[PDB]
Design a protein around this ligand. Sequence first.
Ligand SMILES: O=P(O)(O)O[C@@H]1[C@H](O)[C@H](O)[C@@H](OP(=O)(O)O)[C@H](OP(=O)(O)O)[C@H]1O
Length: 297
Amino acid sequence: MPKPINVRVTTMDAELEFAIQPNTTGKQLFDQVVKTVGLREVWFFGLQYVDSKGYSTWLKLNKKVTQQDVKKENPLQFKFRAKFFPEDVSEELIQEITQRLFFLQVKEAILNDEIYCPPETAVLLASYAVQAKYGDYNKEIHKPGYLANDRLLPQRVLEQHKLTKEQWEERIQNWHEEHRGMLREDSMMEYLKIAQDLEMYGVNYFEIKNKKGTELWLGVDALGLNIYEHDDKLTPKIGFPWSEIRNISFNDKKFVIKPIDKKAPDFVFYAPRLRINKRILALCMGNHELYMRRRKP
Ligand SMILES: O=P(O)(O)O[C@@H]1[C@H](O)[C@H](O)[C@@H](OP(=O)(O)O)[C@H](OP(=O)(O)O)[C@H]1O
């Protein structure tokens, strides 16, 4: 009689562990996590893991987690993260819990430079993050240098020799002071409001190439498909909202965008490995279904 498998699921700010059955499905496991967290806006999330070959991967709901080549470790390692992003944080993130998990994930991303962010904006962001952690600024508790141990800015901004840490840190203090009567909840939501407008926010980039053989970037967001030149991942060269796409399919390393736009050329591009296009497709499918449920429903 088969022994249970140990699994470790980690949210941005929590450690969860379960004892799964040899025949448990990704869906049943997802069900457990969500029920345990009390998350309701489930359509945004999913479970992430690394496969035996080393790649990061999204867990398939409709299968036995045991049949998904997830790198064998004692407690199996899983990461609960947001897979899809809303079009407007304010209208779609209702639960206080969902709001927090998005703030925590987006912040990390900013902090790692995964999402470009102008220095002055970065400081402005950092200030809300502290109002959320340290509450209101009290001159007696929050003595100067109360942040010198915090990770607040990306390493990219600190490289601004125009100022120094303590300088940058007091810049943030100014903005912290200005946020006095602000709730924790509200501050995290302002952070999200400011970050959702950043060009690189919510877009999944993929290294691609066209007929010509030229390097190109492919972005999949909640709103459609964007093709970026190489030196610029902020501003698209050609776009394709979900309401402008008639059909998208891939051949081996062949991707065809069929535009609803009756008298417009099909856009075609080639992606490196096959398992890549496989995932690019899954995202398109997802952001598309989420795009519809926002209108037609
Ligand atoms: O029939 P199953 O048990 O789902 O078997 C396949 C498995 O779930 C893959 O992970 C999935 O790729 P995605 O990650 O792109 O879903 C593939 O989809 P496909 O058949 O549409 O390639 C499925 O066929």
